Write an enzyme that holds these catalytic residues in place. Structure first.
Site, PDB file in Angstrom:
ATOM      1  CE1 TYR A  26      61.742 -15.516 -74.459  1.00 33.95           C
ATOM      2  CE2 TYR A  26      61.381 -14.945 -72.163  1.00 33.95           C
ATOM      3  CZ  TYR A  26      62.216 -15.387 -73.171  1.00 33.95           C
ATOM      4  OH  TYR A  26      63.538 -15.666 -72.906  1.00 33.95           O
ATOM      5  CE  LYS A  44      52.364 -17.222 -77.451  1.00 27.94           C
ATOM      6  NZ  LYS A  44      53.345 -17.710 -78.445  1.00 27.94           N
ATOM      7  CG  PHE A  87      57.733 -20.672 -63.661  1.00 26.68           C
ATOM      8  CD1 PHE A  87      57.146 -19.569 -64.256  1.00 26.68           C
ATOM      9  CD2 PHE A  87      58.866 -20.483 -62.896  1.00 26.68           C
ATOM     10  CE1 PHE A  87      57.674 -18.301 -64.086  1.00 26.68           C
ATOM     11  CE2 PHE A  87      59.400 -19.213 -62.723  1.00 26.68           C
ATOM     12  CZ  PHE A  87      58.797 -18.122 -63.321  1.00 26.68           C
ATOM     13  CG  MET A  88      61.593 -23.983 -67.554  1.00 30.49           C
ATOM     14  SD  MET A  88      61.619 -25.615 -66.792  1.00 30.49           S
ATOM     15  CE  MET A  88      63.339 -25.910 -66.714  1.00 30.49           C
ATOM     16  CB  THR A  89      62.902 -21.752 -60.736  1.00 32.41           C
ATOM     17  OG1 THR A  89      64.230 -22.278 -60.726  1.00 32.41           O
ATOM     18  CG2 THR A  89      61.921 -22.889 -60.481  1.00 32.41           C
ATOM     19  N   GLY A  91      64.542 -18.849 -65.449  1.00 29.24           N
ATOM     20  CA  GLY A  91      64.374 -18.052 -66.661  1.00 29.24           C
ATOM     21  C   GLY A  91      65.090 -18.558 -67.912  1.00 29.24           C
ATOM     22  NE  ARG A 137      65.279 -14.868 -79.978  1.00 30.96           N
ATOM     23  CZ  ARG A 137      66.187 -15.043 -80.935  1.00 30.96           C
ATOM     24  NH1 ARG A 137      67.476 -14.874 -80.675  1.00 30.96           N
ATOM     25  NH2 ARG A 137      65.804 -15.415 -82.152  1.00 30.96           N
ATOM     26  CG  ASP A 151      58.826 -19.072 -78.647  1.00 32.64           C
ATOM     27  OD1 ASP A 151      57.683 -19.402 -79.024  1.00 32.64           O
ATOM     28  OD2 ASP A 151      59.331 -17.956 -78.896  1.00 32.64           O
TER      29      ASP A 151
HETATM   30  C1  LIG Z   1      61.162 -18.997 -73.586  1.00 33.85           C
HETATM   31  O1  LIG Z   1      60.043 -19.149 -72.690  1.00 33.85           O
HETATM   32  C2  LIG Z   1      58.723 -19.122 -73.174  1.00 33.85           C
HETATM   33  C3  LIG Z   1      58.361 -18.565 -74.451  1.00 33.85           C
HETATM   34  C4  LIG Z   1      57.028 -18.569 -74.890  1.00 33.85           C
HETATM   35  C5  LIG Z   1      56.025 -19.117 -74.075  1.00 33.85           C
HETATM   36  C6  LIG Z   1      56.358 -19.667 -72.815  1.00 33.85           C
HETATM   37  C7  LIG Z   1      57.691 -19.681 -72.339  1.00 33.85           C
HETATM   38  C8  LIG Z   1      57.951 -20.298 -70.981  1.00 33.85           C
HETATM   39  C9  LIG Z   1      57.461 -21.545 -70.512  1.00 33.85           C
HETATM   40  N1  LIG Z   1      57.853 -21.853 -69.230  1.00 33.85           N
HETATM   41  C10 LIG Z   1      58.620 -20.777 -68.857  1.00 33.85           C
HETATM   42  N2  LIG Z   1      59.253 -20.598 -67.653  1.00 33.85           N
HETATM   43  C11 LIG Z   1      60.002 -19.485 -67.395  1.00 33.85           C
HETATM   44  C12 LIG Z   1      60.159 -18.459 -68.363  1.00 33.85           C
HETATM   45  C13 LIG Z   1      60.990 -17.234 -68.095  1.00 33.85           C
HETATM   46  C14 LIG Z   1      61.995 -16.783 -69.005  1.00 33.85           C
HETATM   47  N3  LIG Z   1      62.759 -15.661 -68.773  1.00 33.85           N
HETATM   48  C15 LIG Z   1      62.558 -14.937 -67.624  1.00 33.85           C
HETATM   49  C16 LIG Z   1      61.578 -15.330 -66.674  1.00 33.85           C
HETATM   50  C17 LIG Z   1      61.363 -14.545 -65.453  1.00 33.85           C
HETATM   51  O2  LIG Z   1      60.974 -13.386 -65.534  1.00 33.85           O
HETATM   52  N4  LIG Z   1      61.568 -15.152 -64.224  1.00 33.85           N
HETATM   53  C18 LIG Z   1      60.585 -14.831 -63.167  1.00 33.85           C
HETATM   54  C19 LIG Z   1      62.733 -15.998 -63.875  1.00 33.85           C
HETATM   55  C20 LIG Z   1      60.806 -16.484 -66.935  1.00 33.85           C
HETATM   56  C21 LIG Z   1      59.496 -18.646 -69.602  1.00 33.85           C
HETATM   57  C22 LIG Z   1      58.712 -19.831 -69.852  1.00 33.85           C
END
Ligand SMILES: COc1ccccc1-c1c[nH]c2ncc(-c3cncc(C(=O)N(C)C)c3)cc12
Length: 271
Positions: A26, A44, A87-89, A91, A137, A151
């Site tokens: 991202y 971000k 944070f969304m645990t 992903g 995604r 996003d």
């Molecule tokens: C679309 O998400 C975004 C795009 C742009 C800016 C912020 C986000 C975003 C906000 N809260 C989030 N929480 C988790 C993940 C996340 C997504 N995929 C994998 C992970 C990861 O590596 N873990 C540790 C589960 C985390 C991404 C975000």
């Protein structure tokens, strides 16, 4: 209570930055921790452009919904700028679907996911906002299959019914409505088209869209009325909604309000 108070601004040292999440997928988005509340957050950031960042921050300060990733704060008084969200645990949804046990993430769960997302989009629709990058995604997963749209880098409050991208501007072809690909015209209806593609990603548990087709033939194919086939195991009513979202004429596509009550009803009917 003081002259320079701003309900969203946070002190950067209040945040612990860890590592870039989603495997850099991202851009500059990191897992971090809001020390004082001992909370894991997503952050971000920016390198040393800014109009886009500020606009994104501005958009998030205005939207609030159970199924939209929530802004918690920002650091925009001086570099480096931060946009701090919950944070969304689990992903992103694309990865979640690709790696899940399919008896756990059953048919009813897929309906649940679509319902949540359409609910977020009904809310955006009513507030006259457009997302512009709806895709698996860009959706996130929490506990108990909670799903949230994320996003908002391309999101914006529309003044009229369409927004014209500058040009030279390139888009994620496979998720882009014909009118957007051909005339850079985006609208709530182009988000509805993207939602239809997202539904296909959900029905196939994360498959890449338009299997085997070259990005170059996409528009020509759509122009001939070719549309992706019904995924194996996708209920007929869901595919029907998929096809409606992909009506050539944007005015012919359903609204998110319609899509949502349709999904909420199918979800309940499968208890
Ligand atoms: C679309 O998400 C975004 C795009 C742009 C800016 C912020 C986000 C975003 C906000 N809260 C989030 N929480 C988790 C993940 C996340 C997504 N995929 C994998 C992970 C990861 O590596 N873990 C540790 C589960 C985390 C991404 C975000």
């Amino acid at each position: 209570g003081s002259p320079n108070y701003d309900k969203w601004e946070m002190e950067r040292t209040d945040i612990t930055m860890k590592h870039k999440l989603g495997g850099g997928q991202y851009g500059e988005v990191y897992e971090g921790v809001w020390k004082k509340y001992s909370l894991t957050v997503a952050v971000k950031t920016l390198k040393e452009e800014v109009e886009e960042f500020l606009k994104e921050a501005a958009v998030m300060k205005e939207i609030k919904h159970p199924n939209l990733v929530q802004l918690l704060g920002v650091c925009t008084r001086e570099p480096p700028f931060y946009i701090i969200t919950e944070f969304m645990t689990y992903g992103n949804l694309l990865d979640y679907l690709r790696e899940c046990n399919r008896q756990e993430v059953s048919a009813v769960v897929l309906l649940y996911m679509a319902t949540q997302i359409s609910s977020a989009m009904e809310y955006l629709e009513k507030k006259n906002f457009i997302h512009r990058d709806l895709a698996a995604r860009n959706c996130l997963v929490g506990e108990n299959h909670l799903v949230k749209v994320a996003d908002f880098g391309l999101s914006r409050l529309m003044t009229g019914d369409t927004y014209t991208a500058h040009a030279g501007a390139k888009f994620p072809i496979k998720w882009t409505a014909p009118e957007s690909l051909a005339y850079n015209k985006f609208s709530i209806k182009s988000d509805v088209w993207a939602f239809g593609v997202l539904l296909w990603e959900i029905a196939t548990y994360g498959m890449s869209p338009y299997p085997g087709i070259d990005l170059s033939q996409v528009y020509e194919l759509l122009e001939k009325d070719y549309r992706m086939e019904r995924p194996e195991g996708c209920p007929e009513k869901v595919y029907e909604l998929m096809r409606a979202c992909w009506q050539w004429n944007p005015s012919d596509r359903p609204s998110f309000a319609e899509i949502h009550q349709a999904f909420e009803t199918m979800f309940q009917e499968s208890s």
